[model samples]
Target: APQQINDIVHRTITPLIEQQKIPGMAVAVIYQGKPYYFTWGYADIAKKQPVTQQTLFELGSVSKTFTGVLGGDAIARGEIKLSDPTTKYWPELTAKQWNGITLLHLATYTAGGLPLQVPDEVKSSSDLLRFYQNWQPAWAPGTQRLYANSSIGLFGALAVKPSGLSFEQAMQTRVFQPLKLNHTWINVPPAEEKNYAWGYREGKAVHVSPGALDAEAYGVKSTIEDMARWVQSNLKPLDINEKTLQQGIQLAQSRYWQTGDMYQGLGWEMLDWPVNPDSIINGSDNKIALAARPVKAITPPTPAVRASWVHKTGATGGFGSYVAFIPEKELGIVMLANKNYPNPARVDAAWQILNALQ
Candidate 1:
């Protein structure tokens, strides 16, 4: 059975490494609840170190999935008020500049038109506050889905504030520990440094630079095993133990905004199941992912369709990642690469692998 999966995974992944020059990848496929894992290539090409399931890969915005889950916990603990105006916490965002902008707007990236990244001028916490305090909305909140980091960064910051923990600690104590994700980290500990992979950007070793709110947006480092287990949790929500926490996580994963061909969850994106793989690729393409798209509100927001593909893609300076699962099919997949290859390739490979195994 391992060899069968090995053959299938290699047939799809080895070509990707050859075509893209990707240094390494850790992949997980859940087949109707059964889990399969594969590790390929090198974590450190120069050091000639091979990759393993234990090797940690930067998760990039896939970390936002945890932020979304943590957001659910924030709501359960009354640490966040989705209906409250953000000005409730940061009084700097005057009503004049932030009227009608609610915390829900930020979690969904529908808070007017913040850019994809925090502005370069916002170099410090005070600078971030100043940027928001003086800002003007490009569109009405909940009107457009810009798919930007700025919105969720603020959302994550606020969600954790009342918990009296740093964003890192809140996620650790609330999401990671409870879920038994002991290997996942917002700050990879020095003791685990040996397991961390060196991400490659165009064949040069690189690492994501610490930037404002990056910890909330794209700063997670984890292994394929923990990620596969995360997929398992989503596949069976009640298994998470905390009914209150799961209720919020359930809400975050719901279809909150209809952005063109895809539905927006707090962190995940939704598309009809058994979709043409191309739709998955195009929906997350830069044109759709990096730019604002027309949005239709899902009044009385609904959970993902039973047969839908709920997914997310993430990247940093050097790594690329994608996760997708279909509830009706009872299957999921996680793909993590040490090299920041194109998102299309990641989507295509997983699409084909899942197709064959299903």
Candidate 2:
């Protein structure tokens, strides 16, 4: 069975990476609650360092899933409510306009249209407050789904504020620790320096740029081993010893809105099972990445206790990744790579690998 899984991954990633020109990849396939790991190409092409299980890849917006779980865990503990206003946690905002935005809007990427990145001038928290002071809603809150770090980042920050810990620490106490993830980090400590994969952009190695709220929004780095563990947790939340963590996973994967082909969950989005790659590829071009598309609220919201094709895509300028799982099949896959490649290639390759897993 391991050999069969390895062959599926090899055959799919081989020609896919060659055609897409990705420098390296670390992949994991989870079936029947067991994980099989695979590596390919180079973690550092110039140094000829081959990809390995120890190599850490920046999860980009996949980190948003962690943020989602963080918020969900807080909600489960009654520390914060999605219906709570954002100002409730960060009341320093004299920004009267925030009256219209709630924690739900922030978590759902519908904070009346925040930008994908924090504004360039926002160098500190004071600057961030001022930005919100001037930030006005383009549409009613929850009327449009615009993906943005500014929104989810604040959702994470505000959700964890009552813990009296920093966002990173809150993630540790609230999310990572409960899940027993030892290898994930928001700030890569010095000891694991060699474990971090060298990211590439246009053939030049690069790293994540420093920015406000980036950590809470997307600053997670981890190996395939830890990631597969989390994916497995989401697949079988009941198996986790922490009951609150189960609620966290439940809320994180719940559907909040629908925009065309995608059903927006707090963390992972969903399309129907047995989906075609083009459905994901349509969102892949990321025309929606920057645009605030109108979204219909999923009346009463929908939860996935047992499911298929629950997934998310993440990439910084230098790295790209995709994760998807079929709960019904007890199967999941995570693909991590050093170079940011096209989403279509990532989706198509994973689509083939996942379909073949059945």
Candidate 3:
């Protein structure tokens, strides 16, 4: 079975890297609760550094999933409620345009019409409040999904504020330390800086700079080994023996809203697996990627139609990443690369490998 997986990886991934000219990549797979890892190309091509299980890459919006985890945990601990108004935490965020917005709307990307990024001039916490104070919604709250980082970034900050810990501190105590994910971080420690992969765009090395709310949105950097454990936790939160975490995992994965064919969970995207993999891949294409508008949430069919495969995609200026797992099958996959490429190739490759496992 290991050999079969190895063959599938080579067949599906090797050509993709060569064809796309990716400088480096790290992949991890979990089958039936066991983990397997593979690496290809370089971490720093000019310096001849190779990628390994310990190599770290920026996770982009995949970082949002961690925010979801924290939010769910807070809810389980009774620190916050989904229905709580956004203004409850930050009374200064008095924007009449966002009158009906709640934590649920923020987590689900349904907070009216926050844009993809806050204005460059708005850099600090006070600046963020000012931006929201003067902002106006383009659509009514809970009526559309705009795929905004600002909404979730602010959501993440508020999620942990009641804990009396900074966002980084809350994540360390509530998530990374408990999960034993030593290599994951919002800021890679100085000792491990060398392990951070050097991303390339068109043969030139590049990395993401810290923006206004980048840490809450796209600032996670992690290794394949650490992510393997994260995927395992998502599949089996009971393994952690913490009731709050277990509850949080379920809350994070539950479908909260629907936008046409897409289902929005807290921080992940829910899809019906064993369907047309091509459609899944194409749906993630940039052209129609963020075009979904809100629709009524409906119950997805049971194990037959809704196998409950949860996934999220991420990309920084120079890196592309994807994570997907089917809890029912005890299967998961993680792919990280040092080039900003389309999601279709990553999704297609992951789906093909998953099909082979099935």
Off by over 4 Å in 2: none
1-358 in candidate 2: lDDT tens per residue? 5778888999998897888888999999998889999888888887888889889999998999888888888888888988888888887876767887999899988888887788878988889888878888788888998889989988888888888889999888767887778889999999988888889998899889888888888899999999999899988887877777788888888888888877877777887777767787667667655577899988888887365578888999899999988888899999999888877778888888888877
What lDDT, from 0 to 1, does candidate 3 have? 0.85
Model 2: colliding residue pairs: none
Q: Scored by CA lDDT, what does every candidate get?
A: 0.85, 0.85, 0.85
Clash count of each predicted structure: 0, 0, 0
Best by lDDT: 2
Clashing pairs in 3: none
Model 3 vs. true fold: TM:
0.96
What tens digits encode model 3's per-residue C-alpha lDDT throughout 1-358? 5799899878999999998899899998899978899999899987899999999999998998888888888999999998899999888777677678899888888887888887888888788888888878877878888888888988998998899998888888888888999999998889998898998887889888878878888889999999989999988877887788777777888787766566777788787666578777898887666664755644441221227668999999899999989888899999999998899998998999988987
Kindly report which residue pairs in candidate 1 clash with one another. Answer: none
Off by over 4 Å in 3: 298-306
